[PDB]
UniProtKB/Swiss-Prot annotation:
The modification Phosphoserine is found at residues 11, 45. This is Phosphocarrier protein HPr. Belongs to the HPr family. It is found in: Cytoplasm. Phosphorylation on Ser-45 inhibits the phosphoryl transfer from enzyme I to HPr.
Amino acid sequence: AQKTFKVTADSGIHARPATVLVQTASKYDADVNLEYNGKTVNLKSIMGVVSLGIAKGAEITISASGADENDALNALEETMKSEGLGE
């Protein structure tokens, strides 16, 4: 019920990736959260990720817990490589 992605976008994760990621996760009622720096935050938060301070060449772990938790984590995987944001 989770996965790991390798941030490769040369810039980090700010509002550009936080807006496209919050929209995809919003499509699923499951609880999608983002784990980074040993801290738990919400994938639908633009300021929450900014507090983490994610940068290029980083590692994160997504998690889903609900009814369509499976379609949410795999739906974010194709959305990442589709826009060249992570892998």
